[PDB]
Amino acid sequence: MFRILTINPGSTSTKLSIFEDERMVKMQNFSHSPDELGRFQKILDQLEFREKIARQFVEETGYSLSSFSAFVSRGGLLDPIPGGVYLVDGLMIKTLKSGKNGEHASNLGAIIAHRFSSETGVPAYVVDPVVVDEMEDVARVSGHPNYQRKSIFHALNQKTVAKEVARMMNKRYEEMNLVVAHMGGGISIAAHRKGRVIDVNNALDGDGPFTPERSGTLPLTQLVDLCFSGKFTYEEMKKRIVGNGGLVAYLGTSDAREVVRRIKQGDEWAKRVYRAMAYQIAKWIGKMAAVLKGEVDFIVLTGGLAHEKEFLVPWITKRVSFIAPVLVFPGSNEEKALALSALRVLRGEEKPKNYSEESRRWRERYDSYLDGILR
Amino acid sequence: MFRILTINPGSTSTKLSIFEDERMVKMQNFSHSPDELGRFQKILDQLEFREKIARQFVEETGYSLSSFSAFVSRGGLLDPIPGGVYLVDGLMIKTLKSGKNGEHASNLGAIIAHRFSSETGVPAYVVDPVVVDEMEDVARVSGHPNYQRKSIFHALNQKTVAKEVARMMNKRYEEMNLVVAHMGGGISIAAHRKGRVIDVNNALDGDGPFTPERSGTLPLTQLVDLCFSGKFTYEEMKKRIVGNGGLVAYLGTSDAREVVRRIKQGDEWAKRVYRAMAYQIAKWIGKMAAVLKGEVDFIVLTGGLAHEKEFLVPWITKRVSFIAPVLVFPGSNEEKALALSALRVLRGEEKPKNYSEESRRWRERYDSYLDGILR
Ligand SMILES: Nc1ncnc2c1ncn2[C@@H]1O[C@H](COP(=O)(O)OP(=O)(O)CP(=O)(O)O)[C@@H](O)[C@H]1O
Ligand SMILES: Nc1ncnc2c1ncn2[C@@H]1O[C@H](COP(=O)(O)OP(=O)(O)CP(=O)(O)O)[C@@H](O)[C@H]1O
Ligand code: NA
Ligand code: NA
């Protein structure tokens, strides 16, 4: 019986849970109000504030941090790496604290687990960071030398549902081909070729179909124009990619249930914009089908939007069932996903990756690719 | 946004959770040691003890019981009723407190929700009690007039996975035919005919295949003999049906992972007994296939034992795939299951049943059946 602690720091919340083997024994979401949050200049300044909530969470359990077998955290903005469960080390910490790859609340998670680790000797891990990158070189070329397509998406949910589909039919994730569509506030559509995400859109940076809250890919010219059109507000213009865009920008809401209600009342602009979102998701799924050369076992719809079975799901299904049957796996459980990955490691069913080495192996391969600087 | 509280009292534990719509915000399992538990004569005496833990659980949340939209509890030993979400009323309470249908820790749940209800005005519900009974008359005949086959199983998990399978393929639970096998410490195999469990074994009372901890159906003669063979210990002989039987009685453990480890070491008695359990599950699935006249869309393996994909799952699959394809849906989430059922009701997507009336409609039909007393 292994007792595990999962750490999941988000932009506006902090989720923690305790697992005893595969059974969850405690979980609590600690939301943070804009007020309470704006009290910090840089994101790193929240470090002690959030650690305090975690120590407190275990504290009022009667258990001590040394009674745990592992501490597991959501990855963060680490350098590109293959999927898997990594041991938190010195290089990871240095990178996270220096925000060399950007600052994000999720970076605090690994740091927090590491300290819990230095005080108890218990192992700390991070699994499937948002920077998981397992794509093929051909997918990196963008059309212009000083631009690269990068793999930045909800890799944890992707990998997790893919393995769930396999396990459901007692097959191996490694022997299938899938098109998995994670449709939440962010939308990533990935091509899984034999356990490897060979191509996917850069969801986190706003590339792809538009979402309930993001605008997704936008017209090039019209952009470079409205770019320096005086309307320049590096911030304002920058929030139209991850904050103020998509359904919320057209209908004034990012709640699908609200939008479906309107469609049932005869709202035509609402239905036209919602239908356009499904239309885009379908197109991208088509892109990924072409990536797999048509060899697709299943198309999987997952994420919050997969719950909407009256319009969205049926619309997508009609357009893409010619590629492969459609399977719906609604939602996503980050806590359970992280704890199980740590259990597999503790049970010796999976080998822990070493971020340090693993990062070098990746950069070495990427650097050989990047050697296109030869004129 | 509806805030819901789920109440789940078990034999040795108490699980509570708080949902804000479909998002879980707090959950905690309160295990109770034999010492702390044996401090009460009758099960009803734990009433105030467990209520105190629930009030405390919400207490340290900052929220007040009146800020909730609903209180949801696991059913209990109520009189037979169709599946669904019931409003807790006076008749239910009277029945639970009087243990007329038996005493069980799960009975405390509804009672606790009801009080929370009388203090705040908020609605209290119980969903899919273990006594859900939707079988056909033909399935009730046992072979002897003063004996009836009763439907007592983990109806919540059954109903829940069945609907999940449907939703997965965007079809309606009401338009399919399934054989669902819940394989945990208790094993129920049910025939789902168009959204109605028309037949299933009385898992809770020890009828069916043997389990990791229960003996299941036993030889009649050998039983009636060993019945009054002096070895009579109404208790001891009674615990060989739900406590001391099955794998634990043969191998000395009810942990499948432990048993699989032994099989990998060459243990032959272990492998022979484990294989016999799969063998039995398969036979019962065959019984249910005959109940559906072969019209089966899918065979679904769910519950803890569904996690064991090295032996159990593959053994069952080989024996029954001639009936219909096999789908594996491991585990079971009671908290999420209860909260979602209350959300659907609060959202008006499902109508709440009235235990009082619903119980009469059931007994009336049963009584017409029972009218076989006409010589
Ligand atoms: N039952 C339901 N019916 C219809 N829509 C639902 C739903 N539950 C959630 N949604 C919608 O699906 C969308 C996504 O929820 P999800 O939990 O995946 O998003 P997120 O807020 O966590 C952001 P991201 O996906 O980038 O992490 C929501 O924005 C909501 O509009
Ligand atoms: N990952 C895993 N691999 C193999 N076996 C597992 C497992 N997780 C659980 N099990 C086994 O499956 C069985 C059932 O767990 P489940 O959670 O359904 O049981 P339960 O204890 O809740 C009793 P009941 O099913 O009657 O409520 C356990 O008895 C255990 O031996
Ligand atoms: Na777009
Ligand atoms: Na038996």
Side-chain angles (χ1 to χ4, degrees), chain A residues 285-323:
Chain A
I285 286 176
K287 280 173 68 176
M288 299 305 102
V291 168
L292 292 169
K293 301 197 179 72
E295 301 295 299
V296 180
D297 296 310
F298 297 92
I299 292 179
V300 187
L301 309 183
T302 178
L305 296 179
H307 287 293
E308 206 282 286
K309 48 170 286 301
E310 308 186 59
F311 301 92
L312 195 67
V313 169
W315 283 336
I316 292 176
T317 297
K318 279 176 168 52
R319 321 197 76 98
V320 302
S321 60
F322 72 97
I323 291 159

mmCIF file of all heavy atoms in Angstrom, chain A residues 285-323:
data_model
loop_
_atom_site.group_PDB
_atom_site.id
_atom_site.type_symbol
_atom_site.label_atom_id
_atom_site.label_comp_id
_atom_site.label_asym_id
_atom_site.label_seq_id
_atom_site.Cartn_x
_atom_site.Cartn_y
_atom_site.Cartn_z
ATOM 1 N N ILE A 285 -9.315 17.376 -37.248
ATOM 2 C CA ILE A 285 -9.298 15.936 -37.101
ATOM 3 C C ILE A 285 -8.980 15.352 -38.477
ATOM 4 O O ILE A 285 -8.358 14.295 -38.592
ATOM 5 C CB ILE A 285 -10.658 15.421 -36.595
ATOM 6 C CG1 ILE A 285 -10.801 15.764 -35.105
ATOM 7 C CG2 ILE A 285 -10.777 13.922 -36.833
ATOM 8 C CD1 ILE A 285 -12.137 15.404 -34.520
ATOM 9 N N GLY A 286 -9.407 16.057 -39.521
ATOM 10 C CA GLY A 286 -9.136 15.617 -40.875
ATOM 11 C C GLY A 286 -7.647 15.752 -41.142
ATOM 12 O O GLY A 286 -7.049 14.899 -41.795
ATOM 13 N N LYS A 287 -7.044 16.826 -40.634
ATOM 14 C CA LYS A 287 -5.613 17.043 -40.816
ATOM 15 C C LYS A 287 -4.851 15.876 -40.215
ATOM 16 O O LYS A 287 -3.960 15.309 -40.853
ATOM 17 C CB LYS A 287 -5.152 18.353 -40.149
ATOM 18 C CG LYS A 287 -5.440 19.607 -40.982
ATOM 19 C CD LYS A 287 -5.128 20.909 -40.245
ATOM 20 C CE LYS A 287 -3.646 21.085 -40.009
ATOM 21 N NZ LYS A 287 -3.357 22.397 -39.368
ATOM 22 N N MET A 288 -5.209 15.508 -38.991
ATOM 23 C CA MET A 288 -4.534 14.410 -38.318
ATOM 24 C C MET A 288 -4.789 13.060 -38.992
ATOM 25 O O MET A 288 -3.936 12.184 -38.954
ATOM 26 C CB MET A 288 -4.935 14.378 -36.842
ATOM 27 C CG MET A 288 -4.540 15.649 -36.096
ATOM 28 S SD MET A 288 -2.650 16.131 -36.211
ATOM 29 C CE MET A 288 -2.729 17.534 -37.524
ATOM 30 N N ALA A 289 -5.948 12.892 -39.620
ATOM 31 C CA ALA A 289 -6.232 11.639 -40.316
ATOM 32 C C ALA A 289 -5.250 11.508 -41.483
ATOM 33 O O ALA A 289 -4.753 10.421 -41.774
ATOM 34 C CB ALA A 289 -7.665 11.635 -40.836
ATOM 35 N N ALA A 290 -4.963 12.626 -42.144
ATOM 36 C CA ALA A 290 -4.034 12.621 -43.270
ATOM 37 C C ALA A 290 -2.623 12.361 -42.780
ATOM 38 O O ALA A 290 -1.776 11.871 -43.534
ATOM 39 C CB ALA A 290 -4.085 13.940 -43.997
ATOM 40 N N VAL A 291 -2.367 12.698 -41.517
ATOM 41 C CA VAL A 291 -1.049 12.481 -40.920
ATOM 42 C C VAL A 291 -0.828 10.989 -40.710
ATOM 43 O O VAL A 291 0.285 10.485 -40.828
ATOM 44 C CB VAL A 291 -0.923 13.198 -39.562
ATOM 45 C CG1 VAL A 291 0.320 12.740 -38.837
ATOM 46 C CG2 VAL A 291 -0.873 14.693 -39.774
ATOM 47 N N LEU A 292 -1.906 10.285 -40.404
ATOM 48 C CA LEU A 292 -1.838 8.853 -40.184
ATOM 49 C C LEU A 292 -2.089 8.086 -41.473
ATOM 50 O O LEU A 292 -2.263 6.869 -41.456
ATOM 51 C CB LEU A 292 -2.860 8.443 -39.118
ATOM 52 C CG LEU A 292 -2.551 8.954 -37.707
ATOM 53 C CD1 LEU A 292 -3.739 8.725 -36.779
ATOM 54 C CD2 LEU A 292 -1.296 8.249 -37.194
ATOM 55 N N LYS A 293 -2.110 8.801 -42.596
ATOM 56 C CA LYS A 293 -2.345 8.172 -43.901
ATOM 57 C C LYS A 293 -3.659 7.388 -43.929
ATOM 58 O O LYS A 293 -3.778 6.386 -44.625
ATOM 59 C CB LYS A 293 -1.191 7.223 -44.253
ATOM 60 C CG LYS A 293 0.175 7.885 -44.314
ATOM 61 C CD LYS A 293 1.166 6.998 -45.051
ATOM 62 C CE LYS A 293 2.537 7.635 -45.167
ATOM 63 N NZ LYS A 293 3.236 7.658 -43.849
ATOM 64 N N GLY A 294 -4.634 7.837 -43.153
ATOM 65 C CA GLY A 294 -5.912 7.154 -43.118
ATOM 66 C C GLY A 294 -5.970 5.952 -42.192
ATOM 67 O O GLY A 294 -7.058 5.461 -41.905
ATOM 68 N N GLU A 295 -4.813 5.475 -41.728
ATOM 69 C CA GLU A 295 -4.753 4.321 -40.818
ATOM 70 C C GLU A 295 -5.154 4.764 -39.417
ATOM 71 O O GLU A 295 -4.304 4.987 -38.566
ATOM 72 C CB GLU A 295 -3.335 3.739 -40.765
ATOM 73 C CG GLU A 295 -2.777 3.273 -42.099
ATOM 74 C CD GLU A 295 -3.553 2.102 -42.687
ATOM 75 O OE1 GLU A 295 -3.609 1.031 -42.034
ATOM 76 O OE2 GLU A 295 -4.109 2.247 -43.801
ATOM 77 N N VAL A 296 -6.449 4.888 -39.177
ATOM 78 C CA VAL A 296 -6.931 5.332 -37.881
ATOM 79 C C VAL A 296 -7.843 4.277 -37.281
ATOM 80 O O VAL A 296 -8.783 3.814 -37.932
ATOM 81 C CB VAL A 296 -7.725 6.665 -38.021
ATOM 82 C CG1 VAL A 296 -8.222 7.142 -36.665
ATOM 83 C CG2 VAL A 296 -6.850 7.710 -38.651
ATOM 84 N N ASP A 297 -7.577 3.887 -36.043
ATOM 85 C CA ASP A 297 -8.431 2.891 -35.417
ATOM 86 C C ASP A 297 -9.667 3.578 -34.842
ATOM 87 O O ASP A 297 -10.792 3.154 -35.106
ATOM 88 C CB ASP A 297 -7.667 2.128 -34.330
ATOM 89 C CG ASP A 297 -6.509 1.320 -34.891
ATOM 90 O OD1 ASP A 297 -6.730 0.567 -35.866
ATOM 91 O OD2 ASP A 297 -5.383 1.432 -34.355
ATOM 92 N N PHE A 298 -9.456 4.645 -34.072
ATOM 93 C CA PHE A 298 -10.565 5.399 -33.492
ATOM 94 C C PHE A 298 -10.287 6.889 -33.416
ATOM 95 O O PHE A 298 -9.138 7.315 -33.359
ATOM 96 C CB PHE A 298 -10.876 4.938 -32.072
ATOM 97 C CG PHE A 298 -11.324 3.528 -31.979
ATOM 98 C CD1 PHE A 298 -10.407 2.512 -31.752
ATOM 99 C CD2 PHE A 298 -12.667 3.207 -32.123
ATOM 100 C CE1 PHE A 298 -10.825 1.188 -31.667
ATOM 101 C CE2 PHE A 298 -13.091 1.895 -32.040
ATOM 102 C CZ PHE A 298 -12.169 0.881 -31.811
ATOM 103 N N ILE A 299 -11.359 7.674 -33.449
ATOM 104 C CA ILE A 299 -11.336 9.092 -33.280
ATOM 105 C C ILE A 299 -11.902 9.276 -31.877
ATOM 106 O O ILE A 299 -13.019 8.801 -31.612
ATOM 107 C CB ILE A 299 -12.143 9.837 -34.340
ATOM 108 C CG1 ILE A 299 -11.464 9.702 -35.707
ATOM 109 C CG2 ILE A 299 -12.307 11.308 -33.973
ATOM 110 C CD1 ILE A 299 -12.201 10.391 -36.834
ATOM 111 N N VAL A 300 -11.188 9.940 -30.978
ATOM 112 C CA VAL A 300 -11.672 10.093 -29.616
ATOM 113 C C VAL A 300 -11.938 11.525 -29.205
ATOM 114 O O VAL A 300 -11.051 12.378 -29.246
ATOM 115 C CB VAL A 300 -10.668 9.485 -28.591
ATOM 116 C CG1 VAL A 300 -11.253 9.481 -27.190
ATOM 117 C CG2 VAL A 300 -10.270 8.082 -29.013
ATOM 118 N N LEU A 301 -13.172 11.781 -28.797
ATOM 119 C CA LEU A 301 -13.549 13.108 -28.348
ATOM 120 C C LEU A 301 -13.498 13.110 -26.823
ATOM 121 O O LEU A 301 -14.197 12.338 -26.175
ATOM 122 C CB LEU A 301 -14.958 13.445 -28.832
ATOM 123 C CG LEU A 301 -15.181 13.222 -30.327
ATOM 124 C CD1 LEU A 301 -16.592 13.660 -30.684
ATOM 125 C CD2 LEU A 301 -14.145 13.990 -31.138
ATOM 126 N N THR A 302 -12.658 13.965 -26.253
ATOM 127 C CA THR A 302 -12.541 14.056 -24.801
ATOM 128 C C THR A 302 -12.518 15.520 -24.356
ATOM 129 O O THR A 302 -12.360 16.425 -25.172
ATOM 130 C CB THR A 302 -11.266 13.328 -24.299
ATOM 131 O OG1 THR A 302 -11.152 13.474 -22.877
ATOM 132 C CG2 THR A 302 -10.028 13.889 -24.978
ATOM 133 N N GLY A 303 -12.686 15.749 -23.062
ATOM 134 C CA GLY A 303 -12.699 17.109 -22.553
ATOM 135 C C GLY A 303 -14.112 17.554 -22.225
ATOM 136 O O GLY A 303 -15.072 16.827 -22.484
ATOM 137 N N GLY A 304 -14.241 18.753 -21.664
ATOM 138 C CA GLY A 304 -15.550 19.269 -21.299
ATOM 139 C C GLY A 304 -16.583 19.298 -22.415
ATOM 140 O O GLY A 304 -17.727 18.876 -22.226
ATOM 141 N N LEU A 305 -16.182 19.785 -23.586
ATOM 142 C CA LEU A 305 -17.097 19.880 -24.710
ATOM 143 C C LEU A 305 -17.634 18.525 -25.159
ATOM 144 O O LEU A 305 -18.624 18.464 -25.888
ATOM 145 C CB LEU A 305 -16.419 20.599 -25.881
ATOM 146 C CG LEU A 305 -16.035 22.076 -25.652
ATOM 147 C CD1 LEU A 305 -15.345 22.633 -26.896
ATOM 148 C CD2 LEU A 305 -17.275 22.897 -25.330
ATOM 149 N N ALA A 306 -16.998 17.440 -24.726
ATOM 150 C CA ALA A 306 -17.458 16.109 -25.116
ATOM 151 C C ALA A 306 -18.751 15.767 -24.383
ATOM 152 O O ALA A 306 -19.439 14.805 -24.726
ATOM 153 C CB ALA A 306 -16.392 15.069 -24.814
ATOM 154 N N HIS A 307 -19.079 16.562 -23.370
ATOM 155 C CA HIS A 307 -20.302 16.349 -22.606
ATOM 156 C C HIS A 307 -21.514 16.795 -23.420
ATOM 157 O O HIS A 307 -22.609 16.262 -23.253
ATOM 158 C CB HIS A 307 -20.284 17.159 -21.307
ATOM 159 C CG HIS A 307 -19.357 16.632 -20.256
ATOM 160 N ND1 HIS A 307 -19.563 15.429 -19.616
ATOM 161 C CD2 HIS A 307 -18.239 17.165 -19.705
ATOM 162 C CE1 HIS A 307 -18.612 15.245 -18.716
ATOM 163 N NE2 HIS A 307 -17.796 16.283 -18.750
ATOM 164 N N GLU A 308 -21.324 17.780 -24.290
ATOM 165 C CA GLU A 308 -22.431 18.296 -25.087
ATOM 166 C C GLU A 308 -22.793 17.360 -26.243
ATOM 167 O O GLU A 308 -22.269 17.481 -27.346
ATOM 168 C CB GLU A 308 -22.088 19.705 -25.597
ATOM 169 C CG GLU A 308 -23.309 20.570 -25.881
ATOM 170 C CD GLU A 308 -23.975 20.228 -27.198
ATOM 171 O OE1 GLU A 308 -23.404 20.588 -28.254
ATOM 172 O OE2 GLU A 308 -25.061 19.598 -27.180
ATOM 173 N N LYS A 309 -23.718 16.441 -25.973
ATOM 174 C CA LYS A 309 -24.151 15.436 -26.945
ATOM 175 C C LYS A 309 -25.368 15.778 -27.800
ATOM 176 O O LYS A 309 -25.814 14.954 -28.596
ATOM 177 C CB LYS A 309 -24.425 14.120 -26.217
ATOM 178 C CG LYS A 309 -25.278 14.296 -24.975
ATOM 179 C CD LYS A 309 -25.736 12.969 -24.401
ATOM 180 C CE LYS A 309 -26.828 12.356 -25.262
ATOM 181 N NZ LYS A 309 -28.006 13.268 -25.349
ATOM 182 N N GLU A 310 -25.907 16.979 -27.646
ATOM 183 C CA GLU A 310 -27.074 17.367 -28.422
ATOM 184 C C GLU A 310 -26.672 17.922 -29.780
ATOM 185 O O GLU A 310 -27.289 17.610 -30.798
ATOM 186 C CB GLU A 310 -27.882 18.413 -27.660
ATOM 187 C CG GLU A 310 -28.230 18.003 -26.237
ATOM 188 C CD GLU A 310 -29.157 18.990 -25.555
ATOM 189 O OE1 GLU A 310 -30.268 19.218 -26.084
ATOM 190 O OE2 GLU A 310 -28.777 19.531 -24.491
ATOM 191 N N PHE A 311 -25.621 18.733 -29.794
ATOM 192 C CA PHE A 311 -25.164 19.340 -31.034
ATOM 193 C C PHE A 311 -23.715 19.076 -31.422
ATOM 194 O O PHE A 311 -23.447 18.438 -32.437
ATOM 195 C CB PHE A 311 -25.388 20.859 -30.985
ATOM 196 C CG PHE A 311 -26.817 21.252 -30.783
ATOM 197 C CD1 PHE A 311 -27.322 21.455 -29.508
ATOM 198 C CD2 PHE A 311 -27.665 21.399 -31.867
ATOM 199 C CE1 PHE A 311 -28.651 21.802 -29.316
ATOM 200 C CE2 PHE A 311 -28.995 21.745 -31.685
ATOM 201 C CZ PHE A 311 -29.487 21.946 -30.403
ATOM 202 N N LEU A 312 -22.785 19.583 -30.623
ATOM 203 C CA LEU A 312 -21.366 19.440 -30.909
ATOM 204 C C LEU A 312 -20.961 18.024 -31.325
ATOM 205 O O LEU A 312 -20.589 17.788 -32.475
ATOM 206 C CB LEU A 312 -20.546 19.884 -29.698
ATOM 207 C CG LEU A 312 -19.063 20.120 -29.985
ATOM 208 C CD1 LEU A 312 -18.926 21.318 -30.903
ATOM 209 C CD2 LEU A 312 -18.308 20.376 -28.691
ATOM 210 N N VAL A 313 -21.039 17.083 -30.392
ATOM 211 C CA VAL A 313 -20.666 15.703 -30.669
ATOM 212 C C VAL A 313 -21.320 15.134 -31.933
ATOM 213 O O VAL A 313 -20.636 14.565 -32.787
ATOM 214 C CB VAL A 313 -20.979 14.807 -29.455
ATOM 215 C CG1 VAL A 313 -20.858 13.344 -29.829
ATOM 216 C CG2 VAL A 313 -20.016 15.136 -28.331
ATOM 217 N N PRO A 314 -22.642 15.276 -32.077
ATOM 218 C CA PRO A 314 -23.261 14.733 -33.291
ATOM 219 C C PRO A 314 -22.787 15.420 -34.574
ATOM 220 O O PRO A 314 -22.680 14.780 -35.621
ATOM 221 C CB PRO A 314 -24.756 14.930 -33.042
ATOM 222 C CG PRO A 314 -24.860 14.808 -31.554
ATOM 223 C CD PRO A 314 -23.669 15.632 -31.082
ATOM 224 N N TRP A 315 -22.511 16.720 -34.502
ATOM 225 C CA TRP A 315 -22.036 17.444 -35.684
ATOM 226 C C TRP A 315 -20.659 16.955 -36.134
ATOM 227 O O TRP A 315 -20.417 16.764 -37.329
ATOM 228 C CB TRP A 315 -21.954 18.948 -35.419
ATOM 229 C CG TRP A 315 -23.272 19.639 -35.451
ATOM 230 C CD1 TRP A 315 -24.395 19.223 -36.095
ATOM 231 C CD2 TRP A 315 -23.599 20.896 -34.843
ATOM 232 N NE1 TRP A 315 -25.403 20.136 -35.923
ATOM 233 C CE2 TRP A 315 -24.942 21.175 -35.161
ATOM 234 C CE3 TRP A 315 -22.885 21.810 -34.063
ATOM 235 C CZ2 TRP A 315 -25.592 22.333 -34.728
ATOM 236 C CZ3 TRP A 315 -23.527 22.959 -33.629
ATOM 237 C CH2 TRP A 315 -24.871 23.211 -33.964
ATOM 238 N N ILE A 316 -19.758 16.770 -35.174
ATOM 239 C CA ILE A 316 -18.411 16.300 -35.469
ATOM 240 C C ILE A 316 -18.464 14.880 -36.017
ATOM 241 O O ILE A 316 -17.817 14.557 -37.009
ATOM 242 C CB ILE A 316 -17.535 16.332 -34.198
ATOM 243 C CG1 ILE A 316 -17.291 17.782 -33.784
ATOM 244 C CG2 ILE A 316 -16.211 15.608 -34.434
ATOM 245 C CD1 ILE A 316 -16.521 17.904 -32.503
ATOM 246 N N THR A 317 -19.262 14.039 -35.371
ATOM 247 C CA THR A 317 -19.399 12.650 -35.780
ATOM 248 C C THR A 317 -19.836 12.505 -37.224
ATOM 249 O O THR A 317 -19.297 11.688 -37.957
ATOM 250 C CB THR A 317 -20.399 11.913 -34.891
ATOM 251 O OG1 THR A 317 -19.910 11.899 -33.543
ATOM 252 C CG2 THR A 317 -20.593 10.485 -35.380
ATOM 253 N N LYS A 318 -20.823 13.285 -37.638
ATOM 254 C CA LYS A 318 -21.280 13.198 -39.015
ATOM 255 C C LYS A 318 -20.167 13.514 -40.001
ATOM 256 O O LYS A 318 -20.014 12.816 -40.999
ATOM 257 C CB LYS A 318 -22.453 14.144 -39.257
ATOM 258 C CG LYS A 318 -23.786 13.590 -38.795
ATOM 259 C CD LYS A 318 -24.902 14.608 -38.974
ATOM 260 C CE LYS A 318 -26.265 13.954 -38.783
ATOM 261 N NZ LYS A 318 -26.339 13.203 -37.495
ATOM 262 N N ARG A 319 -19.378 14.547 -39.717
ATOM 263 C CA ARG A 319 -18.309 14.939 -40.626
ATOM 264 C C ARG A 319 -17.102 14.018 -40.667
ATOM 265 O O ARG A 319 -16.465 13.898 -41.707
ATOM 266 C CB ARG A 319 -17.793 16.351 -40.311
ATOM 267 C CG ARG A 319 -18.846 17.367 -39.914
ATOM 268 C CD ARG A 319 -18.300 18.773 -40.040
ATOM 269 N NE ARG A 319 -18.256 19.144 -41.441
ATOM 270 C CZ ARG A 319 -19.184 19.867 -42.057
ATOM 271 N NH1 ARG A 319 -20.234 20.322 -41.395
ATOM 272 N NH2 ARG A 319 -19.078 20.101 -43.352
ATOM 273 N N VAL A 320 -16.782 13.350 -39.562
ATOM 274 C CA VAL A 320 -15.581 12.524 -39.558
ATOM 275 C C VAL A 320 -15.679 11.026 -39.390
ATOM 276 O O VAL A 320 -14.654 10.357 -39.331
ATOM 277 C CB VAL A 320 -14.584 13.026 -38.495
ATOM 278 C CG1 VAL A 320 -14.225 14.463 -38.773
ATOM 279 C CG2 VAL A 320 -15.180 12.886 -37.111
ATOM 280 N N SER A 321 -16.880 10.477 -39.329
ATOM 281 C CA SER A 321 -16.990 9.036 -39.143
ATOM 282 C C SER A 321 -16.506 8.251 -40.358
ATOM 283 O O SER A 321 -16.339 7.033 -40.285
ATOM 284 C CB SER A 321 -18.427 8.646 -38.798
ATOM 285 O OG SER A 321 -19.307 9.038 -39.831
ATOM 286 N N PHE A 322 -16.269 8.931 -41.474
ATOM 287 C CA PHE A 322 -15.785 8.233 -42.659
ATOM 288 C C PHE A 322 -14.322 7.834 -42.450
ATOM 289 O O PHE A 322 -13.791 6.984 -43.152
ATOM 290 C CB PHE A 322 -15.925 9.115 -43.909
ATOM 291 C CG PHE A 322 -14.947 10.269 -43.971
ATOM 292 C CD1 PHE A 322 -13.769 10.162 -44.710
ATOM 293 C CD2 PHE A 322 -15.219 11.472 -43.313
ATOM 294 C CE1 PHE A 322 -12.882 11.229 -44.799
ATOM 295 C CE2 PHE A 322 -14.336 12.553 -43.392
ATOM 296 C CZ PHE A 322 -13.169 12.437 -44.134
ATOM 297 N N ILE A 323 -13.677 8.455 -41.470
ATOM 298 C CA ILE A 323 -12.281 8.178 -41.161
ATOM 299 C C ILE A 323 -12.156 6.977 -40.241
ATOM 300 O O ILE A 323 -11.317 6.106 -40.452
ATOM 301 C CB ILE A 323 -11.634 9.393 -40.473
ATOM 302 C CG1 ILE A 323 -11.514 10.541 -41.480
ATOM 303 C CG2 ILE A 323 -10.304 9.003 -39.853
ATOM 304 C CD1 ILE A 323 -11.386 11.892 -40.834
#
